[PDB]
């Protein structure tokens, strides 16, 4: 769905923001 981190609930306009977020906040998707 719309670029929205179901983890922090955060949502961005771009995906990169969503990605870098996972690699920033949840730094780790493994
Ligand atoms: Zn998140």
Curated annotation (Swiss-Prot):
Species: Saccharomyces cerevisiae (strain ATCC 204508 / S288c)
Q: What is this protein called?
A: Regulatory protein ADR1
Q: Where in the cell is it found?
A: Nucleus
ZnF (C2H2-type) ranges: 3-26
This protein's gene is called ADR1
- Intact protein stretch covered? 130 to 159 of 1323
Recorded superkingdom: Eukaryota
Functional summary from the UniProt entry: Required for transcriptional activation of glucose-repressible alcohol dehydrogenase (ADH2).
